[PDB]
Design a protein around this nucleic acid. Structure first.
Lengths: 125, 66
RNA sequence: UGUAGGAGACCGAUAGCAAACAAGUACCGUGAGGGAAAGAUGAAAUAGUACUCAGGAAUGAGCAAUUAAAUAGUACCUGAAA
RNA sequence: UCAAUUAUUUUUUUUGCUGAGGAAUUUUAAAAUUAUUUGAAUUUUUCUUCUUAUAAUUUAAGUUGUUUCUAUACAGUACUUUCUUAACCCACUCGUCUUGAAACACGGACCAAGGAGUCUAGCAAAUGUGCAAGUGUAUAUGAUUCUUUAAACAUUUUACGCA
RNA sequence: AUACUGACGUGCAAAUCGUUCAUUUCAAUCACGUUUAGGGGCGAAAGACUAAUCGAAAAGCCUAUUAGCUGGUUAUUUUCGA
RNA sequence: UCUCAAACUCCCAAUAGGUAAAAAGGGCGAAAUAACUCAAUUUGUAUUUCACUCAUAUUAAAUAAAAUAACUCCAAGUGGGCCAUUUUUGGUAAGCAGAACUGGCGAUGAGGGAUGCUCCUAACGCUUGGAUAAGGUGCCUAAAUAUUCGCUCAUGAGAUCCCAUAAAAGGUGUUGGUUCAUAUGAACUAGCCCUGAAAAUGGAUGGCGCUAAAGCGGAUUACCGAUACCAAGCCAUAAAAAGAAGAAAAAAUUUUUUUUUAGAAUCUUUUUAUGAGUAGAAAAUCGUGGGGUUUGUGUUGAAGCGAAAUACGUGAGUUUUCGUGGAACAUCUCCCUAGUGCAGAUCUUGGUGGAAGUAGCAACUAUUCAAAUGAGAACUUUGAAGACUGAAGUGGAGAAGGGUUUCUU
RNA sequence: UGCUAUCUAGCGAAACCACAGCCAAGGGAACGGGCUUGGCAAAAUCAGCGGGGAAAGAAGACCCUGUUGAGCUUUACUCUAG
RNA sequence: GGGAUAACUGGCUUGUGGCUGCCAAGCGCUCCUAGCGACGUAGCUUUUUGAUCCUUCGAUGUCGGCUCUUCCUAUCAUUGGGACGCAGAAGUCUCAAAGUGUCGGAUUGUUCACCCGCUAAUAGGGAACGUGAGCUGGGUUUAGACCGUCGUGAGACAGGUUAG
RNA sequence: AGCCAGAAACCAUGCUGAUUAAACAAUACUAUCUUUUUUGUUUGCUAAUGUAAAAGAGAAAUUAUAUAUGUACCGGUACAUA
């Protein structure tokens, strides 16, 4: 059920996958809100796939936080180090999809100079 | 082709949604329909009072300036 | 409309002219008429599969072989889902 | 033996669940309690009351302490977490028009791509913006304006629309 | 082309096949060529026929005709809500 | 004197309805003004200016999450409704037609009613715990084979509103009563039970079952029982507070070392209340194509695609890894623009399944043997047989129509 | 009795298809394959068959409705060739 | 376009139909009740006909017969009985009973009906008005045609007929 | 209360089926193999793991229920005992 880690409480692990998605193969699993009449979702019959709800929303101290205890910041250029040094105690680097290996390695070295771990550090090696 | 006729149903309940609105209860009311002769004499009286006020106001102001 | 330029906050091959193409064609209709589907290997094929083996042959395999690359071999880019 | 039932009260035995917060002047002030100090009170007190002065503390003023363990690890069969069946309890074809569909109502074999409130005219209110008894610059002219310029810029004092 | 309301009825066939039956020297049958064309023709009349088309042929256009009616009408959360 | 009436009325309810409870006002006075007014310029009327003064320093009766009130503007959706209690009209009646008041459903989950759109309980963010409601407590099925007093045996008993049958009428079955007579004989009476009491797949107190009840009628508690109720946390919405600059801790050996040190108005801190929803309206978002702008990503392999991720977001999504892949890719910095978001239309177009190795390859009497060819021969060729077409011929010729189909290799 | 069916070798479709596929009763849009309670319920198949799938089909040809029509008629209205 | 609305089932109801009652004035020589039973009055059912319009009109194949099976009982006969207005023979009313049986023709479009005959008796019903991918196609009910009546007419007729 | 006889009804008997019981019994023969002990069970494979219920998984009069069991006499009588 509910997932405490320190004073970071996250309410719901399980994603609100879309109503009867396996039943009709054409349906995709990402949420879509029925405008149907007698849909067994909005007409709120118990035991079906649950609706997402704002109530499940994160606590304001946590909001977007990771179990890392640092907010993730995605990095595609070396120059992004300069704000990240001042924020290192509150923010963590993630290196972007594209980043060429020579540049990526250089950013990884820079991140170590900034004393902040890369959360996807082993990538492209 | 075979219609239902009427019902008063829900109309009272609809009326209570915004409530039953009531008079604004003004202290003055337009008096077109009210008693000729007596009301034109009132118009003369009122004009008379206005003239009396005007005479008083004009003389007092002129006295104050001097 | 015919021809010639110049264009674009246009379309990007089920779109855009019916037509990116050997299309006003094929094809269908007694005829007037109706009218498609249809692009892409690679930098270079003056690099387009040599050679060997097993096969009646098709083909297949290879210690053999082009290419940077052949689950890149001309029904050749990528190659989704069912 | 001294019930019982009301009334105002005073406790107590085990125990269940909870811990938000984060105090650069409201985690402050008083209260409380303890050890002091001064004056009183009264049911007269080894938890008796008030207020006079001093300290500490907590019942004030939203959990803290101690000891384990993970572990003396470097990813392991433990731990995190995905997938996977299970099992208990619950779970009727979706869309649809209809007061009313699980229907013996209608559409849907399946998958992919494409696939439906727009544009113009005139009008209105809204809100922004510029100016104000004016406003717009119309057709058009003009320029030391000429890849982008098919716009941009300018207009030698009673033109016209609307007010 | 009368009947077997036969076989066939995802056919051999969008009317076939089998058996039965009517016709067979005349208002006969067949060919080819020819005439009459769309509110028109032509009709031993059944509204019959006029190229798998008919109580108004086929082709193209006015046209994206019109439809108070049928169907469909596409991401998310939050708020007020008949 | 008997019995009476929707469309009769001497009298006459409950329910429903209206006015009332003072400050822009009301009191009692004076002065003014008239073309109104009387016999009569204060004789009144009405108005105006000046006075003196009425509760509200708990409010000229209460009570009120009484401004969430008004009012203006602009617009939507809708105009086929239905159900229940109670009153009710027509109709033999009707899950029938038609009304009234109110509440539901529609537009609504949740717990009970065995099941059930509507009955009852009760309206819903996400969670933890409590205690209850409607309702239960023999088992299915969670809590009592609880307590307590009656009544009840049925050769088709009975068993929770709506609710799925049931009556007049009987009964020397049993149980209480009550009137009479003489612990007996009568007569009544209502409780249970019986008769009255027949239907269609096999069959329905929900089923099993239940009789010292788990039946019927009471009472006594305990226990169980909801997303309703209370406390607590978190989320968003609504309202309200309040706001345009300074040292805390730990580790060392007073001084060295380690962490932190907020001021961005659609903003930050804080508090309380609130959270239903079709049709419908609004706002905040997220994505797609293109444009300007900004500052980046590219072959030390990007986009794309498959598979994923201790990933992030309530969510749409976003971000990322590995694999494939081999060329162009972004902008959230800001803002314009649009052929801009699909599951569905007997959607359009294309591909593809299950149906299925199935339906089927049935007009027209029949082939056999041997040989040759060839990789291979039931259906090619040659021969031998057997057969058939049977001159209205599967034989010759020619027309239409086709057009090299001919013929050799 | 023939020809088929049947079985093999060979070639080889289609209609249809929300998901499907045992009942009984109940309630329910008042006749359920799925729902509630009961009965129950143990692979895989081959050959048949017609009880059911309110089986398949064609936007009820019937009936009703539309200020959609069309056909036809008259001493309906308004015209008009003759 | 329409289950916004008929004809087909189902459903509610049961007026109408059918079946069972209660009673006691008469009838039954005589005798209320062996058998009856009025005037009255209570139920039950839906094999009747209605009333209806909830369900289905992008279709549930519209009557009947044939064929075939199963269920019901409100029993006609067969088995066991009770009563009698019963001497026997019969016969009549009645109860437990659904184990078993319930026919051949003539005439019909026919449920129904109506003769003739057998029988041992020739009971009554349900199953989507049992049963059209079981059959049949005679009938209502497509398009051709006929006669009568009605309509000026075109035409119309739960008026009749033949062909489909 | 206790009883009896009594029907084409009822249940057995009889008869048919019984991969309707995911049923079973007896018999016959056979597959390097069976039995006892030790250690192990942190290219599709080629050492090898599973339990719905250990914790003292302790406990065999009997008709009974408005009375039972022994023992002694002849199902009965007498006497003990729960």
């Amino acid at each position: 059920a509910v997932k405490k880690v320190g004073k970071i409480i996250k309410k719901r692990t399980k994603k609100f996958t879309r109503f009867q998605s396996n039943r009709f193969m054409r349906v995709k699993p990402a949420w879509r809100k029925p405008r149907g009449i007698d849909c067994r979702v909005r007409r709120r019959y118990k035991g079906t796939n649950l609706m997402p709800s704002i109530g499940y929303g994160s606590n304001k101290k946590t909001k977007f936080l990771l179990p890392n205890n640092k907010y993730k910041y995605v990095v595609k250029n070396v120059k992004e180090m300069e704000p990240l040094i001042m924020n290192h105690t509150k923010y963590c680097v993630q290196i972007a999809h594209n980043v060429s290996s020579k540049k990526r390695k250089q950013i990884i070295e820079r991140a170590k100079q900034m004393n902040v771990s890369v959360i996807n550090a082993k990538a492209r090696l | 082709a075979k219609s239902k006729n009427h019902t008063n149903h829900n109309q009272n309940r609809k009326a209570h949604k915004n409530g039953i609105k009531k008079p604004k209860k003004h202290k003055f009311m337009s008096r077109k329909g009210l008693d000729p002769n007596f009301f034109r004499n009132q118009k003369y009286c009122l004009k008379g009072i206005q003239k009396k006020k005007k005479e008083l106001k004009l003389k007092a102001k002129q006295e104050k300036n001097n």
